[PDB]
Amino acid sequence: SPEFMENFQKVEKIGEGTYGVVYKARNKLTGEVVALKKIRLDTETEGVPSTAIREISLLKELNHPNIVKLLDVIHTENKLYLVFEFLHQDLKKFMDASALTGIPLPLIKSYLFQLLQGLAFCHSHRVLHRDLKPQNLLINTEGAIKLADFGLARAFGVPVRTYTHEVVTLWYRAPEILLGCKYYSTAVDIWSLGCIFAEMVTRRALFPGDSEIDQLFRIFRTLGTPDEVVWPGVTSMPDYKPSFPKWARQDFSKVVPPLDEDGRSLLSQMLHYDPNKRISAKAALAHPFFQDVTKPVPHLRL
Ligand SMILES: O=S(=O)(O)c1cccc2cccc(Nc3ccccc3)c12
Ligand SMILES: O=S(=O)(O)c1cccc2cccc(Nc3ccccc3)c12
């Protein structure tokens, strides 16, 4: 039987992703609580780009424990309401609440492993996230972490508004995107996740830039300014400028102090400059860093 917006009682606002506010709501007929996302459409031109429609279709096809579950899509007067499973807690909020002590390594390992499983699945199905950041990763009481807030709308020009609150998306953006690559690859998500891995460990964002050029320079100052030896083709990328300062690479003992050689090995493979050399999500799952991975439950005192 079709669901109608009248069937839902708004409880509270639980956030405001790239598509406006997200509300916790209660289904009046089943009593189930869900997360509702409101999407304002745009018949401004004539419709949604065919390629966009295909990408939304691709995302809808995915069913995985590490991808937030879409339960239904309600259509009403130029508006779309996405009905999702209810989750309300995210990695950003959790890290802020674990600021004083940091998230324990077993949980860091579990979350990273699960996010890699989610990404491996998406990537094998030709789906990229494109906007991975702590804010977009939802967690539940049982220890799962899930991908959400995919960067689909801005990537394929979907007729809908975005970033109701603001931005900070630059911090996790892969260098090939910052340098204007004609075509990027699934490797961009691995870069983002590597930044998130480092952030969980150090309790601070790795490259908190305030502009594309500042973002690039922050990356260069830490990993060294790339050259043809380290990244073949970099000096010919659209936005590459020979005038870029030349910085030497920093040691990870300094960049991510708490990590040992297994952690450093994996991090270095996730932050490799060359997209063609950056570790894939599938290969990362087999990294020695995950030998002892388990599924700890988070301490959530809401
Ligand atoms: O495919 S749907 O499941 O609706 C869908 C699900 C989730 C997000 C969507 C965003 C834009 C357009 C859609 N489709 C659409 C198609 C026809 C009319 C209005 C919207 C979206
Ligand atoms: O909301 S997200 O968490 O990204 C999301 C998560 C999981 C499955 C999704 C399926 C279709 C569209 C989404 N979002 C969407 C919304 C508006 C425009 C384009 C895509 C999905």
Side-chain angles (χ1 to χ4, degrees):
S1 45
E3 299 191 289
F4 291 99
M5 292 318 293
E6 290 56 42
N7 296 169
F8 296 98
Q9 168 61 64
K10 52 171 179 174
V11 179
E12 53 197 49
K13 170 182 181 304
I14 56 186
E16 52 192 307
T18 82
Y19 301 111
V21 67
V22 178
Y23 273 99
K24 170 178 186 168
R26 318 186 64 77
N27 183 308
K28 296 169 187 175
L29 301 180
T30 70
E32 170 174 38
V33 66
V34 297
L36 298 176
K37 183 171 298 188
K38 189 168 63 64
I39 298 159
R40 302 210 64 175
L41 296 56
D42 291 298
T43 184
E44 57 189 305
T45 51
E46 199 61 66
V48 183
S50 65
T51 184
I53 290 308
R54 176 166 162 168
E55 290 291 319
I56 291 163
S57 290
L58 283 184
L59 189 47
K60 288 176 62 181
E61 288 175 16
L62 305 181
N63 302 310
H64 189 278
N66 302 112
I67 296 174
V68 68
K69 185 171 185 181
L70 179 65
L71 301 170
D72 197 13
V73 179
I74 297 165
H75 289 73
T76 184
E77 287 296 65
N78 313 311
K79 299 182 182 186
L80 252 62
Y81 288 94
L82 303 192
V83 185
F84 290 98
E85 58 171 308
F86 173 65
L87 287 174
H88 80 289
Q89 190 63 40
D90 66 55
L91 193 58
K92 179 46 194 190
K93 287 181 184 62
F94 184 55
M95 281 195 299
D96 291 347
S98 298
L100 293 181
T101 53
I103 297 168
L105 182 70
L107 244 196
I108 290 177
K109 194 164 301 198
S110 176
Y111 286 169
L112 184 64
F113 191 75
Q114 292 180 65
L115 292 171
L116 284 166
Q117 293 180 106
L119 289 174
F121 191 72
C122 291
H123 296 171
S124 65
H125 289 64
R126 308 192 303 280
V127 169
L128 275 70
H129 182 100
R130 304 183 176 78
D131 184 33
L132 287 169
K133 55 182 182 289
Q135 171 179 310
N136 303 342
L137 309 171
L138 310 171
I139 61 182
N140 66 17
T141 54
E142 294 173 87
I145 184 165
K146 312 194 174 190
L147 299 166
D149 193 28
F150 287 72
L152 211 55
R154 189 171 66 65
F156 302 104
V158 169
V160 65
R161 184 68 161 188
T162 54
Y163 300 114
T164 176
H165 51 310
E166 53 190 303
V167 55
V168 79
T169 308
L170 297 177
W171 305 357
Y172 306 92
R173 181 171 296 185
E176 59 267 35
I177 296 171
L178 294 166
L179 289 175
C181 58
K182 180 182 187 187
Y183 289 107
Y184 51 94
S185 71
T186 51
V188 301
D189 287 334
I190 300 303
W191 174 277
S192 303
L193 187 52
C195 292
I196 293 174
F197 175 21
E199 184 170 344
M200 286 193 280
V201 173
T202 64
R203 308 173 218 175
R204 184 185 182 188
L206 186 59
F207 307 122
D210 56 27
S211 68
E212 293 170 290
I213 194 63
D214 181 63
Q215 186 66 36
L216 199 74
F217 286 0
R218 278 168 183 274
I219 293 164
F220 290 175
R221 188 196 196 167
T222 297
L223 306 169
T225 304
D227 54 22
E228 291 286 330
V229 182
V230 162
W231 186 357
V234 65
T235 70
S236 297
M237 294 188 78
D239 303 314
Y240 175 90
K241 311 286 171 174
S243 54
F244 287 161
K246 197 301 181 185
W247 280 285
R249 172 180 184 295
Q250 300 305 298
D251 291 321
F252 281 4
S253 62
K254 171 188 186 58
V255 183
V256 296
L259 294 179
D260 53 48
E261 174 68 5
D262 270 354
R264 294 197 282 236
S265 167
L266 175 61
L267 184 58
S268 67
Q269 292 182 64
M270 295 179 79
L271 297 180
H272 195 291
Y273 272 118
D274 187 349
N276 292 156
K277 290 309 165 195
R278 196 170 304 147
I279 194 165
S280 65
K282 180 184 309 185
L285 293 167
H287 194 282
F289 185 64
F290 296 119
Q291 296 180 305
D292 69 325
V293 66
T294 63
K295 194 182 179 190
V297 286
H299 176 61
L300 313 173
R301 182 175 184 175
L302 55 63

